[PDB]
Amino acid sequence: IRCIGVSNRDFVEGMSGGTWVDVVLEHGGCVTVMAQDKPTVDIELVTTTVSNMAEVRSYCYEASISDMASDSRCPTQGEAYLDKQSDTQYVCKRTLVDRGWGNGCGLFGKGSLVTCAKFACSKKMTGKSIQPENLEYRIMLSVHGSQHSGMIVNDTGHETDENRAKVEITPNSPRAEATLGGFGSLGLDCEPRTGLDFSDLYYLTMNNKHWLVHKEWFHDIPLPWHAGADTGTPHWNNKEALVEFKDAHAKRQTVVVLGSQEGAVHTALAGALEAEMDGAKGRLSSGHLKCRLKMDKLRLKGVSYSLCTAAFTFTKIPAETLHGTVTVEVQYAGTDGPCKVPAQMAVDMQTLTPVGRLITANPVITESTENSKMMLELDPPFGDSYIVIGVGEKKI
Amino acid sequence: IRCIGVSNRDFVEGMSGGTWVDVVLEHGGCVTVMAQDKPTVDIELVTTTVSNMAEVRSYCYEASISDMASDSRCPTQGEAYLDKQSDTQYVCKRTLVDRGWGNGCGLFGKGSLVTCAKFACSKKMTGKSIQPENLEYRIMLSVHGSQHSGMIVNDTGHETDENRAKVEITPNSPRAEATLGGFGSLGLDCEPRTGLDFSDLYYLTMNNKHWLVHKEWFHDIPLPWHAGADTGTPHWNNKEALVEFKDAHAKRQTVVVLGSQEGAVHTALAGALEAEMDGAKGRLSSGHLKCRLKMDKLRLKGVSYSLCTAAFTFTKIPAETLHGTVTVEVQYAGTDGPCKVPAQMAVDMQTLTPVGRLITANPVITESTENSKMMLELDPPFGDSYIVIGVGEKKI
Amino acid sequence: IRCIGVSNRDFVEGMSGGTWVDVVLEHGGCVTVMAQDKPTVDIELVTTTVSNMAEVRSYCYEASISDMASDSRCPTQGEAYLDKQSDTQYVCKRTLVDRGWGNGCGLFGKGSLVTCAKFACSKKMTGKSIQPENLEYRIMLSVHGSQHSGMIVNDTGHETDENRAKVEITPNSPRAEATLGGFGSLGLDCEPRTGLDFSDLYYLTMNNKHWLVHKEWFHDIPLPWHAGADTGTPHWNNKEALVEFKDAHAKRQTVVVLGSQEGAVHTALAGALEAEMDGAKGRLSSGHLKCRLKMDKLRLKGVSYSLCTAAFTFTKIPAETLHGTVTVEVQYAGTDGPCKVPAQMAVDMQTLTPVGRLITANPVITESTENSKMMLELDPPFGDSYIVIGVGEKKI
Amino acid sequence: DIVMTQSQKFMSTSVGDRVSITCKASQNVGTAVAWYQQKPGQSPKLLIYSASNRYTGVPDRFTGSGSGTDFTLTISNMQSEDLADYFCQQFSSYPYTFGGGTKLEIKRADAAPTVSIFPPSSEQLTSGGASVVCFLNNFYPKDINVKWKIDGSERQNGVLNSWTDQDSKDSTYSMSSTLTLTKDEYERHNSYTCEATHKTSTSPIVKSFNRNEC
Amino acid sequence: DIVMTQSQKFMSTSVGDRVSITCKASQNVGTAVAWYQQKPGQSPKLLIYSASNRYTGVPDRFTGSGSGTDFTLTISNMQSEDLADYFCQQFSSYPYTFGGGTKLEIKRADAAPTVSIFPPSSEQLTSGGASVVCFLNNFYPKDINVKWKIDGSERQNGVLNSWTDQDSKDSTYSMSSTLTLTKDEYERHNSYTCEATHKTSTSPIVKSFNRNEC
């Protein structure tokens, strides 16, 4: 559960170091802990939420130019400054240009032009900082046993119904004890500040999308960048390099917009995780954690029962999984109190002997409903073998 | 005249070709042209006026700072920009500074300060451009003969009394012919655009003083420079470097004015001519010219006269001059029409043979006043020679 | 406290020499003394005040000239002295100048001019002497233990609170015993006359600013210098060299002011400490001292308490500091008499062994207020580790 | 959205006056305010930007001041070329709203209107419509009110008023007031009156005719 | 020298109003204009610089606009803390002259003054001077005029008027008007009257006494 089809599988054999088993979790995969002292517990990471981000720099995806004007003082002369050079907010470039004679003034020699243009950004891209504090995690975990195989993926009983607890982990609390009612509680300790390798990742937003960026990328990029701390009106740095003021060879110095770059930043970003967000907070998905799982208190709830009478049927037939495990659904029509279900992977029948690991721990169908389902899974040996259920002459 | 005491002397005696003698003139000195058959003409440069100058760049001798303010965004942000960064006209420097905890915010590693100050210049220094066009010259010239030695230096009548004339020379007219009434006219041709080596000299003004500056000095100097073309309000370049914003290991970043530099520019200028000006126009004094003097038409203002009777006296006694010439004043009480005055430098007594050059040309006292003065000068030899004046037994 | 964010850090391991640990202090930084025999004491220098300064020489930043006059005695005749040569206070320079003929007197070889000008200074710069006597120091010191982390930087109480104390050290008293109430008293011995390297530093004032200057600079500088001992009226030495009396080849000898130098002295001073004042005493800031700290009597006030119950909840979340130490705020809701606070940096989870140095000494929250804060800081090992606070199941 | 209120839509000024034009923002806009002047047939021209900065080429007679919600354009030593419409505009947030405008006109001595009344022409009375025209010419100040009566009863519907711009030479205003009614109604009444209320008389100027008289 | 004219020395405003303060320069000053506010006992504080730029920390309610000769400070959504004196200043050339100031005060409902008249005290009448005092208390608006009469004849010399600042709680004004004359003249007349003209009454409030009556 929260397992099987996921296809990225890690089995961790353990129950030695007093449940000291340490495990890594990756948003792609999941690790199942099988320990004789315990029912087999399925851990998977889900979403790592980041909250309380702050803005750092920003950029201009799409430049826009407004009012182009110029003046020239003829021959040697402190490039006559337009008024537009005093307001910032205007690009200006002072170049040398021939004004001969009928350009209006003697010494058709080399003069100077000063061209200026108002510069107003369109759209934007605003980095954001992510700090190890106010970092969260979400670990959903579940326990095989035999719950209804249709419940393999659900989030309705996140806080109730057999094995299924939603554990939060955030810095100021490396530990959370997940109480799975009746199985005891799985001691869980994780290092939030270590694994994900943050503080090197600025959180980045183009128009209605998101990313992550290693610093020394987003810190160094050649576009106009707002100072980022004040949203009142942009007072830019840069402001060249998204605007190329260029000339030919006569009397003119022209200016060009460059037609945003929004296609560049995309095609520029490579090897940067995708990301999504709901409001002030945002949810990455790339898992990394180092969790030392304390298996200390886990109480098998399938001990001290009888063996469920004879009346087992397959529903949907068995199947093979990935790394080679097998799953089974069994519907025990046997009307009894919650009861233990015999299952053995047998090599032939010359002598019904246990062959190969049975990893559901102890399947126990809990209902009085007289018709119930339990999904138990097991990994039989390499050669041909039987999966067997029940101990009565009605066994199937 | 316009000669003698000047002590920087050039004699030019090569009147060969059709009065083609070429002469150089230096505001310090003067050259006298002495040519057999032509009265000796004294040329001297006086003042080279420059007019219709234009402004090029300018600088700030004395900085002044106004309103210092700052803000800081605490570790992990950008440098929070003050409003004062959008107006130009404000120096701003963004530096890194520790803000530890009770500095108000966690992350005790390094934040950022942005300090800004209004920057308003006090006084100024404004270069000006000098172009070869609208360049003038002034050449005063005079002719020895014998006018009253008290008139050696005067200007009240540079176009009437004696044989003085004030010649102008400006580009669009390399030639000026000075008509000295009765001596004919001295053909004069000068190259204005060549000699003085202009176009490399910006005309420069500190407070109420003036200079000249080779370009590649005044073009490169490290001070705040106004663009020079518009006087409405300064929109500076530079700005820094007359203002040092400095900090000390702390929460502070301070700012200093630098207390003008006006003493630097002075002590910086060396080998730069002094200059003065009488308004829009200004008068350098350093002479250079190449003048080809056409001696063609010069009439001897002393031919076809008698010899002035006997009655010569010395007034003020003779004297020696510099390069070795001798001057003499003689007051001929002889009452006669304007008449020629005999003078001979004779080595010996009895048979008075001419010895050594007599360079006044032909001294001719012009008055009917019965008491007149004539200043004639001549260069005798080394050996004890006599200066002699007169022909009658009354000669002195 | 008086530490953490300062970012210039010196840790000085205990001294098994009987509180004989010797420490250097620099106005930039601070050294923390950690000794098992003691609570960890934070020392920092603040301001070194200098008082009872005396004036030595002075200079003239800005020269001003008043009345220029001259006379000349003609050739044979010494330089006729103006009356202005008898008053001092007047620059005078006797030069040789041609007076020919109509300059009024025979002998056209070379006369003499004497030009003189009244010389009156504007502004001034007055050095001052600093002597090792009447030299002070100010050392503020504080002790980590338990204290509102918001109090990390404050002065309101310097004579009260937990234990802060403001220690003065001046020559005639190398020692001061700082009594931090209840912690005993830190024996402190410092050599005032040695460290700062004075007697070589004149204290220097331009207009409304200050500096320090190595002697053999301020003693040798080429400007007019007042004798410094009497303020009645300036009787200068020098008085040339801020005034250049110059003249070309003519009848004139001119004189120039030089337009202060105030920009020079600034641009001249480099590698010179800048010191602010406030009247008669100037506060430098550059620290140097050799202080032998006597740790003899320091009584830990956190011994013989219980362990504060369960109710520990971090605030401001932890953070990293500079050289790698960690700070923590903890608000112990559980209220009792001052109760010792358990803290251990643990390399595991199950059995918590002490790992890495805990340097706050013994954190003891002193209040009855039932809600209190204590800032304890500690340096854990290199690898991943836990910071742990509390002993009860409610520990966080 | 931000409202910029110029409460004085019209101002009369003499050459040399200090003119004060006020602009009030409905919320704090800091210093993000521009001032323009506009003359007929032309685009507006910028005078002041960001509350207090004079644009290049603008005479130093123009100064902007204020911050927050209250902004003022001052014209010192007003000249005749300054007669124009003036607008403020804010740039604090979109939309970049303008004030309603203040039209500056020139003062001269008061002058009573010359009033003339015109019955419908015979040619118009072939049409079934009838217009009675009053011209009120060469008056100052511009404020004037016209009341029409037919056989003693005021008529407000069907009155159209048109004003000339202030005359470029004599600084007066002129107005046409036209009462339009059906021809049938026009021929059912005899007395037609236009009454002009203006500050130059304590009672209105009355022009009236009886349709059937000569 | 440049004259900066703020023609409105006093403005009454309600909280929430758009306030327009005008400054007119006597010659073109470009955008070289600042605006300040000042409260009693404090130095002025900068609001707007170079015509249109809002200084940091100033509420966005304040916006400067204009250029050339005409400058405006607009306060949108005026708040009670904006009550203050406002000044423009130009930086085109020395001297850096200020406008004359505009004092912003708050509007409330009109309120008639309560007027009380006080003959000279017996103690003052030992002195040879005599002061007759009228208090005119708790009125709005501030504009009020007091005329004194002695035995029917107006007296203007010797009248001293003093006004409180607008009250911080009730927004009213109060005034003392004191007629000082010699004791000898005071005892030669019987009737003394102070008359207060104020917009709250069509005729002045009259307080009068006869010296020799009780």
Q: What is the largest CA-CA distance in chain B?
A: 119
C-alpha distances out from residue B141 to B31, B192, B322, E199, Å:
10, 18, 20, 90
Residues with Cβ within 8 Å of C230's Cβ and at least 6 positions away in sequence, in order, are none
C-alpha angle with apex B178: B173 to B183, nearest 5 degrees? 155
Rg for chain A, CA atoms, rounded: 34
Estimate to the nearest angstrom the gap between the alpha carbon of B317 and the chain centroid.
35
Q: How far apart are CA B247 and CA B114, in angstroms?
A: 12
DSSP assigned state of D98:
B
3-state secondary structure of E10: strand
A22 touches chain C (CB under 8 A): no
Using an 8 Å Cβ cutoff, are B225 and B59 in contact?
Answer: yes
Q: How far apart are CA E79 and CA E19, in angstroms?
A: 10
Q: How far apart are CA C243 and CA C228, in angstroms?
A: 21
What's the gap in Å between the CA of A351 and the closest CA on chain C? 46
Amino acid identity for residue B283 in this structure: R
Quick one: D113 and D103 in the same domain? no
Residues with Cβ within 8 Å of E15's Cβ and at least 6 positions away in sequence, in order, are E78, E79, E80, E106
Q: Which residues of chain A make contact with D55, given a CB cutoff of 8 A? A: 83
Residue where one domain finishes, among candidates E55, E82, E107: E107
Q: How far apart are CA E24 and CA E70, in angstroms?
A: 5
Q: What is the largest CA-CA distance in chain E?
A: 69
Quick one: D21 and D101 in the same domain? yes
Estimate to the nearest angstrom the gap between the alpha carbon of A174 and the chain centroid.
19
What's the gap in Å between the CA of C73 and the closest CA on chain B? 16
Quick one: D95 and D170 in the same domain? no
Neighbouring C-beta atoms of residue C171, cutoff 10 Å: 15
Amino acid identity for residue E62 in this structure: F
Of residues B268, B159, B166, B253, the one with CA closest to residue B213: B268
Of residues A218, A257, A263, A252, the one with CA closest to residue A239: A257
Residues with Cβ within 8 Å of C271's Cβ and at least 6 positions away in sequence, in order, are none
In this structure, the dihedral spanned by the alpha carbons of residues C282, C287, C292 and C296, taken in order and rounded to 10 degrees, is 80
Q: Which residues of chain C make contact with A191, given a CB cutoff of 8 A? A: 384
- Residue found under tokens 């605006």: E35
As a three-state string, the secondary structure of chain A is CCCCCCCCEEEEECCCCCCCCEEECCCCCEEEEECCCCCCEEEEECCEEECCCEEEEEECCECCEEEEEEEECCCCCCCCCCHHHCCCCEEEEEECCECCHHHCCCCCCECCEEEEEEECCECCEEEEECCCCCECCEEEEEECCCCCHHHCCCCCCCECCCCCEEEECCCCCCEEEEEECCCEEEEEEECHHHHCCCCCEEEEECCCCCEEEECCCCCCCCCCCCCCCCCCCCCCCCCCCCCEEEECCCCCEEEECCCCCHHHHHHHCCCCCEEEEECCEEEECCCCCEEEEECCCECCCCCCCCECCCCEEECCCCEEECCCEEEEEEEECCCCCCEECCEEEECCCCCCCECCCCCCCCCEECCCCCCCCEEEEECCCCCCCEEEECCCCCCC
Q: Which residues of chain B make contact with A88, given a CB cutoff of 8 A? A: 85-88
Q: Please answer yes or no on whether C317 and B106 come within 8 Å at the CB atom.
A: yes
Amino acid identity for residue E6 in this structure: Q
Residue where one domain finishes, among candidates D107, D128, D150: D107
Report the residue from D3, D30, D35 with minimal CB separation from E72: D35
Rg for chain C, CA atoms, rounded: 34
Quick one: E102 and E126 in the same domain? no
Q: Which residues of chain A make contact with D91, given a CB cutoff of 8 A? A: 233
Using an 8 Å Cβ cutoff, are B58 and B236 in contact?
Answer: no
Among E53, E56, E67, E96, the strongest candidate for a mutation testing the B interface, having the largest count of B CBs within 10 A, is E56
Task: Report phi then psi at D20, rounded to 5.
Answer: -120, 115
Residues with Cβ within 8 Å of B110's Cβ and at least 6 positions away in sequence, in order, are B75, B96, B97, B98, C7
Among E71, E79, E82, the strongest candidate for a mutation testing the D interface, having the largest count of D CBs within 10 A, is E71
D4 touches chain E (CB under 8 A): yes
B233 touches chain E (CB under 8 A): yes
Q: Which residues of chain A make contact with C350, given a CB cutoff of 8 A? A: 18, 20, 294
Quick one: D30 and D131 in the same domain? no
C-alpha angle with apex C178: C16 to C376, nearest 5 degrees? 70
Name the experimental technique. cryo-EM
Q: Please answer yes or no on whether A233 and D56 come within 8 Å at the CB atom.
A: no
The residue count of chain C comes to 396
Quick one: D103 and D33 in the same domain? yes
Among C314, C316, C350, the strongest candidate for a mutation testing the A interface, having the largest count of A CBs within 10 A, is C350
C-alpha distances out from residue C156 to B4, B250, C28, C278, E23, Å:
87, 20, 22, 21, 48
What's the gap in Å between the CA of A26 and the closest CA on chain C? 20
DSSP assigned state of D40:
T
Closest chain A residue by Cα to residue B228? A78
Q: Please answer yes or no on whether A173 and C349 come within 8 Å at the CB atom.
A: no
Residues with Cβ within 8 Å of C227's Cβ and at least 6 positions away in sequence, in order, are C57, C235, C237
B82 touches chain E (CB under 8 A): yes
Provide the CATH number for the domain around residue E126.
2.60.40.10
Q: Which residues of chain E make contact with B83, given a CB cutoff of 8 A? A: 53-56
- Residue found under tokens 């806080």: A159
In this structure, the dihedral spanned by the alpha carbons of residues C246, C248, C252 and C254, taken in order and rounded to 10 degrees, is -20
- Residue found under tokens 């010899």: B307
Closest chain E residue by Cα to residue B85? E56
E50 touches chain B (CB under 8 A): yes
Among B26, B45, B108, the strongest candidate for a mutation testing the C interface, having the largest count of C CBs within 10 A, is B108
Quick one: E116 and E43 in the same domain? no
What's the gap in Å between the CA of E83 and the closest CA on chain D? 12
Q: Please answer yes or no on whether B232 and E54 come within 8 Å at the CB atom.
A: no
Q: Please answer yes or no on whether D66 and E62 come within 8 Å at the CB atom.
A: yes
Dihedral sign for Cα B65, B69, B74, B76, please: negative
What's the gap in Å between the CA of C319 and the closest CA on chain A? 9
Q: How far apart are CA D6 and CA D88, in angstroms?
A: 8
Count of domains observed in chain D: 2
As a three-state string, the secondary structure of chain C is CCCCCCCCEEEECCCCCCCCCEEECCCCCEEEECCCCCCCEEEEECCEEECCCEEEEEECCECCEEEEEEEECCCCCCCCCCHHHCCCCEEEEEECCCCCHHHCCCCECCCCEEEEEEECCECCEEEEECCCCCECCEEEEEECCCCCHHHCCCCCCCCCCCCCEEEECCCCCCEEEEEECCCEEEEEEECHHHHCCCCCEEEEECCCCCEEEECCCCCCCCCCCCCCCCCCCCCCCCCCCCCEEECCCCCCCEEECCCCCHHHHHHHCCCCCCCECCCCCEEECCCCCEEEEECCCECCCCCCCCECCCCEEEEEEEEEECCCEEEEEEEECCCCCCEECCEEEECCCCCCCECCCCCCCCCEECCCCCCCCEEEEECCCCCCCEEEECCCCCCC
Q: Please answer yes or no on whether B83 and E56 come within 8 Å at the CB atom.
A: yes
Residues with Cβ within 8 Å of B196's Cβ and at least 6 positions away in sequence, in order, are B48, B135, B286, B288, B289
Tokens standing for C349? 């989870």
Quick one: E118 and E103 in the same domain? no
What's the gap in Å between the CA of A263 and the closest CA on chain D? 27
Sheet with E129-139: list strands edge to edge. Answer: E114-118, E129-139, E173-182, E159-163
Tokens standing for D146? 């016209």
- C and A make contact (3+ CB pairs below 8 Å): yes
Touching subunits of E (3+ CB pairs, under 8 Å) are B, D
Q: Please answer yes or no on whether D27 and E76 come within 8 Å at the CB atom.
A: yes
Quick one: E132 and E167 in the same domain? yes
Q: How far apart are CA E51 and CA D52, in angstroms?
A: 0
As a three-state string, the secondary structure of chain B is CCCCCCCCEEEECCCCCCCCCEEECCCCCEEEECCCCCCCEEEEECCEEECCCEEEEEECCECCEEEEEEEECCCCCCCCCCHHHCCCCEEEEEECCCCCHHHCCCCECCCCEEEEEEECCECCEEEEECCCCCECCEEEEEECCCCCHHHCCCCCCCCCCCCCEEEECCCCCCEEEEEECCCEEEEEEECHHHHCCCCCEEEEECCCCCEEEECCCCCCCCCCCCCCCCCCCCCCCCCCCCCEEEECCCCCEEEECCCCCHHHHHHHCCCCCEEEECCCCEEECCCCCEEEEECCCECCCCCCCCECCCCEEECCCCEEECCCEEEEEEEECCCCCCEECCEEEECCCCCCCCCCCCCCCCCEECCCCCCCCEEEEECCCCCCCEEEECCCCCCC
Residue where one domain finishes, among candidates E85, E107, E129: E107
Of residues E92, E43, E42, the one with CA closest to residue E71: E92
Chain A with chain B: Cβ pairs closer than 8 A = 72
Using an 8 Å Cβ cutoff, are C21 and C11 in contact?
Answer: no
Q: Please answer yes or no on whether B322 and C209 come within 8 Å at the CB atom.
A: no
Neighbouring C-beta atoms of residue E63, cutoff 10 Å: 43
B265 touches chain E (CB under 8 A): no
Q: Please answer yes or no on whether A172 and C317 come within 8 Å at the CB atom.
A: yes
Quick one: E40 and E134 in the same domain? no
Q: Please answer yes or no on whether A88 and B87 come within 8 Å at the CB atom.
A: yes
Touching subunits of C (3+ CB pairs, under 8 Å) are A, B
Q: How far apart are CA A224 and CA A198, in angstroms?
A: 26
3-state secondary structure of E128: coil
Q: What are the b/e assignments for A5-39, b being 16+ CB within 10 Å? A: ebeebbeeebbeeebbbebebbbebbbbbbbeebb
Q: How far apart are CA D87 and CA D75, in angstroms?
A: 14
Q: How far apart are CA A9 and CA B215, in angstroms?
A: 79
C105 touches chain B (CB under 8 A): no
Dihedral sign for Cα B128, B130, B134, B138, please: positive
C-alpha distances out from residue C233 to C63, C141, C226, Å:
15, 48, 9
Report the residue from B86, B225, B230 with minimal CB separation from A80: B230
Using an 8 Å Cβ cutoff, are A5 and A149 in contact?
Answer: no
C317 touches chain A (CB under 8 A): yes
Of residues B293, B290, B287, B289, the one with CA closest to residue B14: B293
Q: How far apart are CA C52 and CA A175, in angstroms?
A: 64
Quick one: D91 and D169 in the same domain? no
A67 touches chain D (CB under 8 A): no
To what resolution in angstroms was this structure determined?
A: 6.2
Q: How far apart are CA C235 and CA C120, in angstroms?
A: 10
A18 touches chain C (CB under 8 A): yes
- List the alpha helices (DSSP H) in chain E: 183-186
Using an 8 Å Cβ cutoff, are D38 and D84 in contact?
Answer: yes
Quick one: D85 and D125 in the same domain? no
Residues with Cβ within 8 Å of A253's Cβ and at least 6 positions away in sequence, in order, are A70, A93, A95, A97, A113, A115, A245, A246, A247
Closest chain A residue by Cα to residue C314? A172
Amino acid identity for residue B315 in this structure: T
B228 touches chain A (CB under 8 A): yes
C-alpha distances out from residue C114 to B147, C13, C84, Å:
33, 75, 10
Q: Please answer yes or no on whether E53 and B86 come within 8 Å at the CB atom.
A: yes
Range of the domain at D176: 108-211
What's the gap in Å between the CA of D90 and the closest CA on chain E? 8
Q: How far apart are CA C213 and CA C230, in angstroms?
A: 23
Of residues A205, A169, A211, the one with CA closest to residue A190: A169
Report the residue from B82, B87, B232 with minimal CB separation from E50: B87
Q: Which residues of chain B make contact with E92, given a CB cutoff of 8 A? A: 233
Domains of chain C by range and CATH? Answer: 9-51+131-195+282-294 (2.60.98.10), 65-119+235-259 (3.30.387.10), 312-389 (2.60.40.350)
Label residue B152 exposed, middle or buried (CB < 10 Å: 0-12, 13-18, 19+): buried
Using an 8 Å Cβ cutoff, are B208 and B39 in contact?
Answer: no
A82 touches chain D (CB under 8 A): yes
Q: How far apart are CA C205 and CA C61, in angstroms?
A: 11
- C and D make contact (3+ CB pairs below 8 Å): no
Q: Which residues of chain B make contact with A92, given a CB cutoff of 8 A? A: none
E48 touches chain B (CB under 8 A): no
